[PDB]
Design an enzyme around this catalytic site. Structure first.
Site, PDB file in Angstrom:
ATOM      1  N   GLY A 164       0.777  -1.232   0.000  1.00 45.79           N
ATOM      2  CA  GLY A 164       0.000   0.000   0.000  1.00 45.79           C
ATOM      3  C   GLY A 164       0.812   1.287   0.000  1.00 45.79           C
ATOM      4  N   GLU A 209     -10.193 -14.080  -7.627  1.00 44.58           N
ATOM      5  CA  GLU A 209     -10.852 -12.970  -8.304  1.00 44.58           C
ATOM      6  C   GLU A 209     -10.239 -11.591  -8.033  1.00 44.58           C
ATOM      7  OE1 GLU A 209     -13.880 -11.967 -11.258  1.00 44.58           O
ATOM      8  OE2 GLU A 209     -12.715 -13.747 -10.750  1.00 44.58           O
ATOM      9  N   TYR A 250      -5.199  -7.336 -12.273  1.00 44.31           N
ATOM     10  CA  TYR A 250      -4.521  -7.402 -13.545  1.00 44.31           C
ATOM     11  C   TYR A 250      -5.385  -6.950 -14.702  1.00 44.31           C
ATOM     12  CZ  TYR A 250      -0.370  -9.507 -11.484  1.00 44.31           C
ATOM     13  OH  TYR A 250       0.753  -9.681 -10.691  1.00 44.31           O
TER      14      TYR A 250
END
Ligand code: COA
Ligand code: COA
Lengths: 170, 170
Positions: A101, A133, A139
């Site tokens: 992050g 998922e 991506y």
């Protein structure tokens, strides 16, 4: 949470194996890691390296409680497809949770993309688990497409025990 | 019917390209072939290459209606697995229609297996098309396992235009 991205050097092998295991024990496959430091060292820094690695390094004050400066990595190599072109293949991509992050993964992806442009690669390929998922959408947000499902390709393997039989035949 | 399998040589490029095109047809990928003979010679044999090819030759009595002796081939390179290390990756494998069912494919796989043992590869990976029952059985009867089924892996790709976007973003 200061950090820099840089190529891994021979001196970094203990850390890469550490992160591979940390990656493994993030998926509970940690014992499956047969790979040793000697392997990472002979396989990545010899005459013909079999893989390449970019690592994320943090300053002294941000070291892991275990006392380590490398907190993330990407392992990759180049492959080739007569009907696609030269490719950059992303084998592993992992950042330790307490360091996620802050842009580390993003920088790694930008530099891997730049390396791809330098190498004149037509595409970057990688594997994603069909049920993951969250990773799939990450991506796809970056323009990825499921080649296995759209074009009907299945990944196969023939493990060492069978290659041995065939190789020592008769 | 005493076929022989051996490494390819620069003089094999013309046959290799022809076979790549026949394989592309078999895979419904003909139009996307981007490899030229120039590239094969360059990339295949230009000093410490990108890939390696093997070809299978038959004797005069069985050459092709067009007079060719090379009736099949395999194209491979090495990849890496963080758990077990160096792998042998089979990119393309093909045997001309009239020359199947005689053991040509088996011998190429036998040669590839020896390449694997020498270079200390722990496994051989490759893709197979969804509907290619013949190859699926050929592989499985020789110890192969479908990793897309067993482990749920899907091959993903991010092409050049999106790599460019990520390279130039920050
Ligand atoms: C996704 C991954 C690279 C993120 O790395 P990171 O250092 O956190 O990346 P950044 O800090 O630059 O932020 C990346 C993005 O992830 C998002 N994110 C939010 N929470 C996150 C979390 N807990 N973990 C990962 N990403 C998170 C961020 O919001 C950001 O937004 P975006 O993806 O929409 O652009 C992560 O490290 C990882 O390895 N995830 C899964 C493991 C993997 O690589 N699997 C491959 C399956 S093919
Ligand atoms: C599957 C294929 C690639 C195998 O190549 P091949 O040259 O036929 O391989 P072989 O002749 O060594 O083996 C052929 C088979 O018939 C059997 N066979 C071979 N020689 C035999 C013989 N002398 N007596 C009895 N059976 C024999 C083998 O057991 C094998 O059968 P199995 O798959 O059920 O185990 C085959 O040529 C084919 O149909 N290819 C299609 C194109 C293709 O899919 N290419 C790969 C794209 S990735």
């Amino acid at each position: 949470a200061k950090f820099v991205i840089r190529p891994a050097t021979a001196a970094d092998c203990s850390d890469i194996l550490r992160l591979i295991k940390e990656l493994a024990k993030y998926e509970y496959m940690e014992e499956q890691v047969i790979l040793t430091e000697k392997d990472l060292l002979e396989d990545g820094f010899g005459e013909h390296p079999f893989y390449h690695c970019l690592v994320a390094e943090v300053p002294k004050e941000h070291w892991t409680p275990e006392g380590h400066s490398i907190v993330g990595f990407a392992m990759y190599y180049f492959t080739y497809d007569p009907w696609i072109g030269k490719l950059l293949y992303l084998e592993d991509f992992f950042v330790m949770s307490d360091y996620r992050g802050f842009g580390i993964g993003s920088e790694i992806l930008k530099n891997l993309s730049q390396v791809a442009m330098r190498c004149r690669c037509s595409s970057m390929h990688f594997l994603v688990a069909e049920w993951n998922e969250p990773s799939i959408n990450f991506y796809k947000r970056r323009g990825a497409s499921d080649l296995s499902s759209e074009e009907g390709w299945r990944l196969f393997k023939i493990d060492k025990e069978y290659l041995l039989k065939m190789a020592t035949e008769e």
